[PDB]
């Protein structure tokens, strides 16, 4: 179970209705929470208790809380994911906003970023997917990775900067 909510000063969680919104210094965000769970700020910090202490209530509990938390760190520190390209001469670039994946498919894979998200390429073999919401960045860098899952024989593909891909060794 989980309770405390360290909400820095740049937040404004208008807990009105079941639409317990947050507005922030990186851009305003909206987030649906159960109505029958009841959540609000009772001091410097914030809190989400609950009615019954059955099972289901204990389920939409932690869910709901970790979600407001994500929204909080969201408009606050902002979210960002790191990715490594790896394998015999793979590489990526930028087309206005588009990502330029050259992952050894006869014909390359561009990727358009949904709004609220921004692509980044430092060295041409490392990619950063950054922005407001955490869920979406998750839900997109997902795509970027799945463009080529690290194979089981030589770790070639897209991975998380410090991922320990296991290598099966062939012949």
Partner RNA sequence: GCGAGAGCUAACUUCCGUAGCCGAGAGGGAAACAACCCAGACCAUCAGCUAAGGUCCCUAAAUGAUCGCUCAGUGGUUAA
Partner RNA sequence: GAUGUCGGCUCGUCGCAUCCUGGGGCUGAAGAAGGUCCCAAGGGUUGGGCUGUUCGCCCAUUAAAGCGGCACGCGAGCUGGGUUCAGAACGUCGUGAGACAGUUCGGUCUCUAUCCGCUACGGGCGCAGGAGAAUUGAGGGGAGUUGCUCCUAGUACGAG
Partner RNA sequence: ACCGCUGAAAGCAUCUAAGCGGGAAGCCAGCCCCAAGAUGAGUUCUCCCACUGUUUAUCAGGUAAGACUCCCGGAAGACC
> Strand 157-160 relative to strand 46-48: parallel, antiparallel, unpaired?
unpaired
Q: How far apart are CA 35 and CA 20, in angstroms?
A: 9
CB of 102 to RNA, least distance (A): 11
Q: Nearest Cα to 141, choosing from 162, 156, 158, 155?
A: 158
Q: What are the φ and ψ backbone dihedral angles of 124, each rounded to 5 degrees?
A: -65, 0
CB of 111 to RNA, least distance (A): 12
Would you say 58 or 97 has its CB closer to RNA? 58
Location of structure tokens 């960002």: 80
- Binding-site ranges for RNA (CB under 7 A): 1-2, 55-56, 58-63, 66-67, 70, 87-88, 104, 106-107, 134-135, 138-139, 142-143, 146, 149, 151-154, 156, 168, 170-171
Would you say 9 or 49 has its CB closer to RNA? 49
Would you say 49 or 153 has its CB closer to RNA? 153
Q: How far apart are CA 102 and CA 108, in angstroms?
A: 5
* Dihedral sign for Cα atoms in the order 12, 20, 71, 100: negative
3-state secondary structure of 85: strand
CB of 11 to RNA, least distance (A): 18
CB of 92 to RNA, least distance (A): 17
Q: How far apart are CA 147 and CA 124, in angstroms?
A: 17
Would you say 122 or 171 has its CB closer to RNA? 171
CB of 162 to RNA, least distance (A): 14
Would you say 11 or 140 has its CB closer to RNA? 140
């Amino acid at each position: 179970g989980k309770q405390p909510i360290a909400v820095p000063s740049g937040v404004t969680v208008n807990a009105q209705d079941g639409v317990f919104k947050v507005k922030g210094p990186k851009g305003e965000l909206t987030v649906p929470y159960n109505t029958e769970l009841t959540v609000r700020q009772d001091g410097d910090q914030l809190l989400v208790e609950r009615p019954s202490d059955a099972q289901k209530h204990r389920a939409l509990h932690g869910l709901t809380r970790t979600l407001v938390a994500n929204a909080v760190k969201g408009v606050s520190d902002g979210y960002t994911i790191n990715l490594e390209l790896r394998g015999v001469g793979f590489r990526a670039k930028l087309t206005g906003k588009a990502l330029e994946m050259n992952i050894g498919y006869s014909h390359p894979v561009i990727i358009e970023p949904p709004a609220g998200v921004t692509f980044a390429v430092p060295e041409p073999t490392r990619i950063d997917v950054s922005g407001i919401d955490k869920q979406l960045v998750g839900q997109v860098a997902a795509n970027v990775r799945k463009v080529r899952k690290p194979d089981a024989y030589h770790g070639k593909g897209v991975r998380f900067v410090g991922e320990q891909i296991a290598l099966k060794a062939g012949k």
